[PDB]
Every structure is written in structure tokens, then in C-alpha cells.
Amino acid sequence: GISRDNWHKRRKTGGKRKPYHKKRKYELGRPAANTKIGPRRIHTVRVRGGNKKYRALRLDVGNFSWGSECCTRKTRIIDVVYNASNNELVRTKTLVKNCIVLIDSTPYRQWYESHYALPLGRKKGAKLTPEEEEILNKKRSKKIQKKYDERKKNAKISSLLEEQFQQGKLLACIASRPGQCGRADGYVLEGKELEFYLRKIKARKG
Amino acid sequence: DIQTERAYQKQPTIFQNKKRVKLPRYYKNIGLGFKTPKEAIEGTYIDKKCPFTGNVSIRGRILSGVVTKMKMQRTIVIRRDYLHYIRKYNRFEKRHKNMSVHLSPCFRDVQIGDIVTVGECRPLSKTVRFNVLKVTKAAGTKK
Amino acid sequence: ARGPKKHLKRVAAPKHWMLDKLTGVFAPRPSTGPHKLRECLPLIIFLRNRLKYALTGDEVKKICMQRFIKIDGKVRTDITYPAGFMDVISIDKTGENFRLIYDTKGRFAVHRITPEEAKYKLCKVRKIFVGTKGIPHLVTHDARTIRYPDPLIKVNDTIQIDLETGKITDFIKFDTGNLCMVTGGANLGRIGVITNRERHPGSFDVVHVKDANGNSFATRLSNIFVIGKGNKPWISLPRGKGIRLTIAEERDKRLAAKQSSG
Amino acid sequence: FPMKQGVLTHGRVRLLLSKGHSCYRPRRTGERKRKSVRGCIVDANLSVLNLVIVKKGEKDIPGLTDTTVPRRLGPKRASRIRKLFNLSKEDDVRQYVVRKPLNKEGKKPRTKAPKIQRLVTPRVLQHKRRRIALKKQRTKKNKEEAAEYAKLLAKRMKEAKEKRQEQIAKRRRLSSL
RNA sequence: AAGCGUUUACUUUGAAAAAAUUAGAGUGUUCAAAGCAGGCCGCCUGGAUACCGCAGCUAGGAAUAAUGGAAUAGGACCGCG
RNA sequence: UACCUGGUUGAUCCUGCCAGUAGCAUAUGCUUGUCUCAAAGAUUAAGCCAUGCAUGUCUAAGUACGCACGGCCGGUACAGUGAAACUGCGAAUGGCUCAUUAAAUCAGUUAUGGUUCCUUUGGUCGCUCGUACUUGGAUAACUGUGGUAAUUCUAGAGCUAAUACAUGCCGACGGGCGCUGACCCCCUUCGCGGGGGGGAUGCGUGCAUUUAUCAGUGGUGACUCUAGAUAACCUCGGGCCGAUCGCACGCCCGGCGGCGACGACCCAUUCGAACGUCUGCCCUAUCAACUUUCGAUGGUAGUCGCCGUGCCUACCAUGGUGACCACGGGUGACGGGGAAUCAGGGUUCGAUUCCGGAGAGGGAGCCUGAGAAACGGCUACCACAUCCAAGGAAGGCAGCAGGCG
């Protein structure tokens, strides 16, 4: 197959390296995974040393971390928006490392409304009819209200992050290598990182 | 200033999106009695191949050279004069091997003819296996 | 080659085994174990060439399969087990215990020890590891990973382990003035007191060791094994006592003993 | 040339066959070899067809259904013996194992019984007690060695605190000097 | 006792440098080419040593051959606002 | 032993080469009594091969219902050998040759802090909080039918075993640690307020992998090292937490026990393998410019890989080497330790028993396996070549002998 070798190409000066041996097994090269968004299809590949790597081929879930409060949730990926490597990786929705994806914000909304007891998202005009989040937001005791108020004092959220929670989709960068270990984890963008990636998405869209 | 590439430029060690009520910069010692430069700590750039603010460690050999080419970006070409002794003809000869060394951007006052100190590391590219550790100015020419 | 080696040539065999050329093409390749390739002496060579008990390798296989040779706490049934430095071979029927110490030359010595000495042995630690639950681990030269140690132990120290339980009893810390056994190189078999330590950042350190007769010599740290504190070793020493006197003095000691014996 | 299921032809097809495939026994561990088989469609370009009578008709054939051949080997696993004889988990298997008579000229008539595999025996019970006793020994060794290292670390902490107090007393002596 | 010290070429010591082969201690394979053996009423033993180009590490020297200080003075040094 | 002699001329002295002189290799001619060692299809053809052999293997310790032998003490399975076979491991070791290869291999010195690693050895393996006195069905060996001219070609029918293939809990297991926390208690304030404790239900809480944060037990010259805590995953083409076996036999009043063997998740050790740092190689200018959007030299971000790298991909900059000989070509060049000649200097050979590299006529691709781009492994093309009943099958002696050229 394809070989990883520094001898198949030219020198520093420009001459040609004549082959003194053929392709080896330690010069192993395998084709790309190029995973998609769908039901979980992860194959196993025996590698050098008897170990196993995990090729994703279609994958939707991803355990994504939010770093200002350091909590991860298993979140389904729905869209691929930005990739600094190739424009074709944005055209055809292919997950690789350092992709900017739109992820569901409802587990982070549930965690925020269960921890800090503050409304998150919730465009004015709608109320929850199963009443479960209303029960989770109301019905507080005497001395635990001080702890909820001390949580409320340190619950400032950014403007662009608040707009993204209002839209319901967050921007997440894929940090784990998806085609090697099979997992496609990552972290939610915040601050100047999110401003830079939104400026690049706006420059792409025009 | 910085961040002119397509992706975001940051250091993989430090975190910068903490709860706010200057960004923290990571640096490290290099060993072998070499002192760290001031601008590598004071600056706001990044470099993943810098021997002070990057994921690379200086091992093996520590050598020297003289700078002869600076036409490349984030790397320079040094020149190495050495004398070879043939056992038959008891004289010397001038040979030079001009290796490519990754010039870290912590040094800015670098011209040609400057004696530079290089150090062995992991191969960062096809022909670069060396980082610039310290830069000595050439003989004379204060301006 | 397309994998790991399994044979070893007689010419490619190391010098300290002192094997002969006329007999065989191959040499007994030592198996994988606590010691390296060119630092040990196998059980088949120790039983056939040094002691001259058996005659053939089949007889060596018969001796090791009658369960007679008990190497350092457990009977091994292999003829090419790596028996390196500080190894106690216990033979039950003869009542003889052998400690593998180097001679003053490059070879090992047939060194007879008491069972009171054979109960313990001394081993230099190589490194200190931190296990998965914050547990310190000592890794020695014979790959003995011993955990929960005395926290006084450093990288270049020696520990006195017990063969019947596999636990440490005492230790020698690397201090200036202690004894030394040079375990490798041109000074293979030298015994002297440590008089200088020279550190090197990046480069490899060196130790100047002074002989008891006044012969100071430098030695790299990779071939240094301390055997006691000051001038009191905790092992028994073979004849020669690690001096390496001159070849004219060796000729004199041979000729005077020959003319005295007659 | 033999047949093959699923290749779905009528002529002659050469295919790669490995371990786990029909009409090819591997010789090396993982050896693959081109073999020549036929499709699973029955035509006149054949020699022998293998037929299995599933349902027996009205009349009785004297060639197949007349002479009945008994089974050659009996069950060997005790669970299969229980499944055959409809046994419980408390009754005996050794008295209910199937044994075979042996008779020929010259030698005496014998009766041979198979070795029952996976039968509950006190040797397996002793091994089952043995590995959990080794687990108990490992846990007791970890507890005793952790307690001994806790005592040793407490002694080292006491002497290190004494050394720190000596160093702070030396600093106080230098400050008074 | 630990650290620093204007850079090289040079020069001296020290470790690392696989064996066989090269020289060479001992040995009556009847001598010798060879081999690592043998002698005594269980022991004595040896199976050494030397060379190992070239490059690299370390520890002293600065004669020799380069290299530059400060000259529109943004020149050193002990101190201040 | 730092060595000369004859030859141009009628004769002399030079330069100058030739011829003598002595070894080490290769062949050849003549002759040949003993004995100890001893090279031996390398030079042209790394050209082609009939024949036969060269890697298979069982211990009391994985499977034993072939009477092939076999003991009588049996009805409480298997006395003990044991063909064949499943499974495990080796077959990636060794032998041959130098075809290719000129900063390539290789020699000296380095690091893997940038990676893997069978076996052996030393550590781990009630740490996890939810039928176990032992789980399920398929098959070989065997009985029987055979197809083909022929193969180490195999199929349908009846079975039967696992340390081959999957599922999988009892015991520790009663309480600890973080959370939600119903609710309760004490003091003070007229009161809101403030301070200090106990606690129902449920969840998570072993090692290993992935994501990010906080702090900084033990070291290195140096970590984004080892380790602690924090919020989850733990790839159905699933990760370990023994659903194994053998020998004498004991202690309680059914429960407890030894010597071992084998297989295993992780950390070390060893044999290594591979990528890298610096220096070193024959001749040629009738080879002066070479490389480069068919990667050339770097940066950013990815893919693959065991890991670091244009190894490869998308976009940017036009760079990189060279008269100190790059680039191109040739070699009757594998490199080295070494061999011969020798005053000192050097000159020539090295394919050859020791190490490293390459390979089985030429390339290319892959399963197995820890380790192969393996060829006494396969898969396609070129060249050679075997049996045929004319449908097909089958091969790689630069291994050992042997045959042709």
C-alpha cells in the first residue's frame, strides 16, 4: 500500500534516492477513516504490537466538555460548519480533529437550570407544560437558599454564549482524534476563541 | 499582530476562558545552564516549535554555527566551518555542512555573521532537528 | 533481520565466558531474564566449563531437570538462564552455595559462601517509579520491582534483600569513602574506596575510586556497585581481593610460588 | 470440483478461500488460496447430487428407512447428559452415563465408559477454594504492608519535622547573630 | 563543597570503545604449525597484556594561527531623581 | 635487513623506461612415499533444474467412548501406554549469495523526554456496590456414500470434547467518601437576618483509554514526567477482574487448606527492531548549475502510522544545494572488524565462516503472527518450466548433495 518513508523522495540538495530495499511492514500506511454523522459504526483495526485502533465511519454522539465550569456531556452532533484544513471537509460533512460543529445545548441548559437555578435560553412567551423544570427551579428550603444565592452571584454568562444558548446550538471544537481511538470528543468554544471562529465563519459565508 | 492563519493560535498548556470576576503564558527551563530569554516570557505570540514555549525538549548534542541565510520564515540556515585532517597529506581542508535550524521568534536582533548556539531535539521537519538556544552578536558592528 | 535473534555464535560470545573455539560453531545464547546479554554467565557454562561437574549439555539438562540447582530462591529448569552479578546458586545435595562475584580479571569466580551468607544478597537499585496509587517502587539491576521502600533510598544506592521473603533489610547510600565493585569495562574486577564524584549536566557522570594500595582510577557511573560502608564490606571476597597488580608482579608471585612448591 | 453456497453461478468459479470457508481446509494459520468451485444452481453439468430426505412419505423404501443405524458416540458433557435423560441438578450423572460394550475374538468382553468433562469434583472445589484463598492472602499482604509503610512514613515525617525545626532554629540563631 | 567565566584550531590525562585476527606471558599437541591447556600427592591454577585510525564527552595550558572591544562615543564602573 | 643488477654508445656521465629480484593470490604442466591441519561454482551465468532431504513438536500438569495394546477389584465416569486429530507454540531462527546500493549501507559517539516489544524474571490481579457445587451450541479423529485421470483436492448424512468460539454471576458486601438533601436541633436579634451540627431516598466511587480544569508524593540538566482531586465515555468488528489441569492427603462440627503448571488487563527487565545528532567513502567536468505547483525548501491545521517529520493532504512564502565539486554518470563498489607488502610514509584486496544491510528469476499486494511486505506463505502480471484422459492441476536449490550451460 502507501508507505511512510523518508527514502522514497528527494534529498535536501535535490538528488534522487535510489531504492536499496522494497517497502516494509513498519512503513505502514492505511487509508483515511473519513467519518460521517449517523448511527455509530466503529470498526477495529489490528495495529503494530498486537493492539487495536478504532476507526469511526459514521458517528453522531460526542462527550463534549464546557471548560468555564469543567463539565462534559454526551451530545449529538448535528452540523459541521468550519474546518481550517480543507474546504471539502466543510462541503461534505466529515469529522476530523479541530472541526467546529454545532452541538445541542439542552444538557448544558438542564445542568445550568439544575445547579444555578437561573433561566437559560427561554425566549419570552413559552412555559413548560410538563412542569418538571418549574419544580426544579421552585421549591427551595430556608438555609439552602443562601447556597443558591451564592451560586447565582457567580453565574455571569457571556453575550455571544448567551445568544448561542438562545439559538440552541453551541460551537464545539473536536479535540480528540476521531479516526484513531474512535471517540470524537472536544470542547465548547468560549471568549476570544469563539470570536475568532465566528469571524472566520462570517468571512466564509459573506 | 498575531493569529493570521485559518485556525486559532493558542498554547496547549494554559487556559484563557476562565471566569473574570493579561493572558497567562507558559514557559519552562531548558537545561545545560542556558538562561531563558526575556521576550519569550514577555511576548504574546505562540510557537509550537519554540524550545521554551513549545512541546519540544533539547536532548543529545549542543553545537554552534554562524548565520548565513535568513530568507525563510520561523527558521534560518546556519554555516559550520570545520577542518578535516587527512592522515596521508598532513594538512587541513575547509568543509562545511549548512544545516537548517528552527530560529525561534524569541530572538529579534539576528543578522548574518552572528555566532549562534544550536541544540539537538526531535525532528520538527524534514531537515530541521535543532533549536536556537542563545544568540551571540558578531564581532564589532554595534549599530 | 526480520525479528529477534535466537542463536549466538561461539566467536560472537563475550570474552568473560572464556569459551573455546575448537568445539562448536554456536554458543549458548542466554535466555531473557534479570540480566543483560554480555553481563551474565549462563548456567550451562557455569556447570560445565567452570565447575567441570558434567560433560555435555544433555548432562547439564539432566542435572537441571532432576531439580538440584536452586538459583536465588526458586529452581529454574532452563540451561541458559541468565546468571549475572550477585546471584546465589544453591545446590542441595553437595551442600555448597556459590555467589557469582567477578574475579580480579574479567571472568567470574567460583566463590563458595556459607548458607548464612546465602540467605541474603546485595542489589543496586536502578530507578524509582511511582505506581498507580502513589506507591514508590524500586527497580534494581536484576529487575526486582520492590514497593513500599525506605524513603532514604536514592537512585544509585544498594539494598540488602532477603531471599526467603523478597523484602529489604538494610541499605548502603552512595557516599564518599565507601567501597566499590566496578561491574564492567576495562576495570572489571577492581575493589577500592570512593574518593571523588564529578557530576555532569547533560553528559554522563564519573567517579574517581582510589584503591587500598593507592591506585586511583576513574569509572563511569553505569558500571559501579558499592559493597559496603567505609572499609567494611557486607559480602565475602574472593582471592586477589580486587587489586590488579602488574604483570611483572604476577610473574614474580607465580615463579616464587612454583619454586617454593617444587 | 465441489459446490459452494452463495456464489450463484452455473459454470466454474475460482475464489479466494481462507479459514472458515467451505471446500478449503487451511494448512498454515491463516493461509489463503485460490480454489475452483461450482455455483449453487443445479444443472445437468454435474456428477453426484447430495440429497437429504427431510419428510418421509407414505411408502417405505427398503434401502434407507429399513435398516436403522444407531449413534456411534454417546454424550460426554454432564449438562448434555442431563439434557438427554431429563435430569435435575442433584441426581447422579456417573450412574447415568452411557457406556459401550466391546467384544471380539481372542480378547475378553469389556465395557468402556467415557471420561465425563466438567463434572463437579472435590479437586475443582479445592482449586476454587485455592484461588479465593490466594485473593485473601493478597488482600492481607496489602493491608499489612500498607500498615508497615504507614508506620515507616509516620517515622520519616516525625524526623523530617525534627529536621525542619532544627533548620528554623538555625535560622533563628542566624537572625539573633 | 556547589555555580559562572570571549569563542575556536592546537596540545596532555581519564572513561566508553564486541569477539576472531596483529604482537606478546604461561603450557612438552614427541618438536613445530596449532589449541587453551596441565602438574602433584583434592589442591594449585591460568585462560593476561598491548594496538584499537577518525569523530564526540570531560579535566589543565594560552606560546602559536584567527577573532573583536571605545573613535559622529547610545564607551565601561560605584552611586542617585 | 631503510639493499641492487644487465640493456641505447667506439667508449663515458645522466634522464628515462624495459628486463631481471622476492612474497602474497588464481589457473595450468610434470612428478609424488608418510603424517597433522586445511581453502574449495565467487570472478563469465543473482543462469536453469530431474531426484532425495532440509521445521515440526506432549509433559504425572489443555482435549483419549480407534479394544491398536491392555489389569480385574468393578457397575461410584476415566487403571496405564496410546495411532490419528483439535488446540498452543515455532515456522520472522539458521544456511547461501553480494544482485542492488556511493551520506545510501556500514564504522566510532549519542538519545527515543518521539515508539513498539513473544518468551523469561520481578511487581499487580476480594480494592468496582450490581445456574455459579460450573452456562450455550458447532466441529475434528470415528461409521458410511463417494466425484476427479491426477493434488498435502475434499462434501453432503450420524455424532462427540475444550485452556478452540461466545455468555456470565454468587463471595468479598457492612459500611466508608462526594453530591443532590426532604427535614430536625441550639444561640442571638421585636422581626427579617447571622452562626454551628445530625440526617431519609437515589446516583457515582477498581485498574486501562479519551476530553478539559485546579493544585503541586517522588525524580531528571530539562515535561505537556509519575502521581492526587474534579464532570462523563469505556467502541457489540466489546479490555482484565481464572466458568482450566496434575500429585501424595490432612483440620473442625457441610465448612477450610499445600506443591505446582498454563493463560492473562497494566508497570518494569532482557533479546531486540526502527527512526533520529555529528564525523568518515573510488573515479569522472568530454557532467556547471540542480530541485520545484507530478513536494522542491518551510509555516499553519489535519489524515495515516507504533511514535516525530511534506510521509501524505488544503492554503500561503519562494525558498533549499553548489567550485569547500552540488547535481548527473560509471564501478570487475555491500560496508566494517580484517589480509598481503612493508624503514617511516603509504599501495592493493576484502563476496568469503565475526557484526550490520539486501533477497530468494523481476517488480507489486496481503492474511496470520509480538515480530514478514516472509517466498521449504499466499495473491495478479513478465520470463522459464511439469503431469494431463485436453476438463484441469501445480513450481521457485544466490540451502544440502547432485545435473546442463
Swiss-Prot record, chain A:
Q: Which UniProt keywords apply?
A: Acetylation, Cytoplasm, Isopeptide bond, Lipoprotein, Membrane, Myristate, Nucleus, Phosphoprotein, Ribonucleoprotein, Ribosomal protein, Ubl conjugation
Lipid bilayer topology: Lipid-anchor
**Where does the record place the modification Phosphothreonine?**
T129
Q: Report where the covalent cross-link Glycyl lysine isopeptide (Lys-Gly) (interchain with G-Cter in SUMO2) sits.
A: K169, K192
Phosphoserine occurs at: S159
GO molecular function term, any single one = structural constituent of ribosome
| Location of this chain's protein in the cell | Cytoplasm; Membrane; Nucleus, Nucleolus
User: Can you quote a single GO CC term?
Assistant: nucleolus
Where do Basic residues bias regions lie? Answer: 7-25
Q: Where is this region: Disordered?
A: 1-26
Positions where N6-acetyllysine occurs in the chain: K36, K127
Predominantly, its location class is: cytoplasm
Q: Which family does it belong to?
A: Belongs to the eukaryotic ribosomal protein eS8 family.
**PANTHER family documented for this protein:** 40S RIBOSOMAL PROTEIN S8
Subunit structure of this chain's protein:
Component of the small ribosomal subunit. Identified in a IGF2BP1-dependent mRNP granule complex containing untranslated mRNAs. Part of the small subunit (SSU) processome, composed of more than 70 proteins and the RNA chaperone small nucleolar RNA (snoRNA) U3.
| Name recorded for this polypeptide | Small ribosomal subunit protein eS8
From Swiss-Prot, chain B:
Secreted in keyword set = no
Question: Where does the record place the modification Phosphoserine?
Answer: S57, S100
Assembly information from the UniProt record: Component of the small ribosomal subunit. Part of the small subunit (SSU) processome, composed of more than 70 proteins and the RNA chaperone small nucleolar RNA (snoRNA) U3.
As stated in the Swiss-Prot or TrEMBL entry, residues carrying the post-translational modification Citrulline are: R20
UniProt-listed SUPFAM superfamilies: Nucleic acid-binding proteins
Instruction: Name the GO cellular-component terms.
Output: cytosolic ribosome; cytosolic small ribosomal subunit; nucleolus
Q: What is its main location?
A: cytoplasm
Q: Which cysteines are joined by disulfide bonds?
A: none
Q: Where is the lipid attached (S-palmitoyl cysteine)?
A: C50
Q: Is Transcription tagged as a keyword? A: no
Molecular function GO labels: rRNA binding; structural constituent of ribosome
Q: Explain the post-translational modification.
A: Citrullinated by PADI4.
From which organism does this entry originate? Answer: Oryctolagus cuniculus (Rabbit)
Q: Which PROSITE patterns match?
A: RIBOSOMAL_S17
CDD domains associated with the record: Ribosomal_uS17
| Subcellular location, record wording | Cytoplasm; Nucleus, Nucleolus
Q: Which residues cross the membrane?
A: none
A Gene Ontology BP annotation from the UniProt entry: translation
Where does the record place the modification N6-acetyllysine?
K28, K35, K48
Q: What keyword terms does UniProt attach to this protein?
A: Acetylation, Citrullination, Cytoplasm, Lipoprotein, Methylation, Nucleus, Palmitate, Phosphoprotein, Ribonucleoprotein, Ribosomal protein, RNA-binding, rRNA-binding
Q: Which Gene3D superfamilies does this one have?
A: 2.40.50.1000
* Lineage, opening ranks: Eukaryota, Metazoa, Chordata, Craniata, Vertebrata
Identify its protein family. Answer: Belongs to the universal ribosomal protein uS17 family.
Q: What InterPro entries does this protein's entry cite? A: NA-bd_OB-fold, Ribosomal_uS17, Ribosomal_uS17_arc/euk, Ribosomal_uS17_CS, Ribosomal_uS17_N
Q: Which domain of life is it from?
A: Eukaryota
Q: Which residues carry this modification: Omega-N-methylarginine?
A: R59
Q: What is this protein called in UniProt?
A: Small ribosomal subunit protein uS17
From Swiss-Prot, chain C:
Purpose of the protein:
Component of the small ribosomal subunit. The ribosome is a large ribonucleoprotein complex responsible for the synthesis of proteins in the cell. Part of the small subunit (SSU) processome, first precursor of the small eukaryotic ribosomal subunit. During the assembly of the SSU processome in the nucleolus, many ribosome biogenesis factors, an RNA chaperone and ribosomal proteins associate with the nascent pre-rRNA and work in concert to generate RNA folding, modifications, rearrangements and cleavage as well as targeted degradation of pre-ribosomal RNA by the RNA exosome.
Has the keyword Cell inner membrane been applied to this entry? no
Entry's Gene3D superfamilies? 2.30.30.30, 2.40.50.740, RNA-binding S4 domain
Assembly with partners or alone: Component of the small ribosomal subunit. Part of the small subunit (SSU) processome, composed of more than 70 proteins and the RNA chaperone small nucleolar RNA (snoRNA) U3. Identified in a IGF2BP1-dependent mRNP granule complex containing untranslated mRNAs.
Q: Name one GO molecular function term.
A: structural constituent of ribosome
Q: Please list the GO biological process terms of this entry.
A: translation
Which keywords has UniProt assigned to this entry?
Answer: Acetylation, Cytoplasm, Isopeptide bond, Nucleus, Ribonucleoprotein, Ribosomal protein, RNA-binding, rRNA-binding, Ubl conjugation
Q: What is this protein called?
A: Small ribosomal subunit protein eS4
Q: Does the keyword Repressor apply?
A: no
Where it sits in the cell: the answer is: Cytoplasm; Nucleus, Nucleolus
The Swiss-Prot or TrEMBL record describes its family as follows: Belongs to the eukaryotic ribosomal protein eS4 family.
Question: Cross-link (Glycyl lysine isopeptide (Lys-Gly) (interchain with G-Cter in SUMO2)) at which positions?
Answer: K229
Task: Indicate where the modification N6-acetyllysine is found in the sequence.
Answer: K232
Q: Which Pfam families match?
A: 40S_S4_C, KOW, Ribosomal_S4e, RS4NT
HAMAP family in the cross-refs: Ribosomal_eS4
Report the domain of life of the source organism.
Eukaryota
From Swiss-Prot, chain D:
* Residue segments, region Disordered: 157-177
Chief site of localization: cytoplasm
Instruction: Kindly provide the PTM information from the record.
Output: Ribosomal protein S6 is the major substrate of protein kinases in eukaryote ribosomes. The phosphorylation is stimulated by growth factors, tumor promoting agents, and mitogens. It is dephosphorylated at growth arrest. Phosphorylated at Ser-175 and Ser-176 by RPS6KA1 and RPS6KA3; phosphorylation at these sites facilitates the assembly of the pre-initiation complex.
Task: List modified residues, type N6-acetyllysine.
Answer: K151
Q: Which domain of life is it from?
A: Eukaryota
**Would you tell me the Gene Ontology cellular component terms?**
cytosolic ribosome; nucleolus; ribonucleoprotein complex
The biological process GO terms on file are: translation
Which residues get modified to (3R)-3-hydroxyarginine? R77
Which positions carry Phosphoserine? S88, S175, S176
Q: What keywords would UniProt list here?
A: Acetylation, ADP-ribosylation, Cytoplasm, Hydroxylation, Isopeptide bond, Nucleus, Phosphoprotein, Ribonucleoprotein, Ribosomal protein, Ubl conjugation
The GO terms describing molecular function are:
structural constituent of ribosome
Compositional bias annotation for Basic and acidic residues: 157-169
Q: Which family does it belong to?
A: Belongs to the eukaryotic ribosomal protein eS6 family.
Quaternary structure, per UniProt, is:
Component of the small ribosomal subunit. Part of the small subunit (SSU) processome, composed of more than 70 proteins and the RNA chaperone small nucleolar RNA (snoRNA) U3.
Record's function text: Component of the 40S small ribosomal subunit. Plays an important role in controlling cell growth and proliferation through the selective translation of particular classes of mRNA. Part of the small subunit (SSU) processome, first precursor of the small eukaryotic ribosomal subunit.
The protein in question is named Small ribosomal subunit protein eS6
Of the parent protein, the shown chain spans 61 to 237 of 249
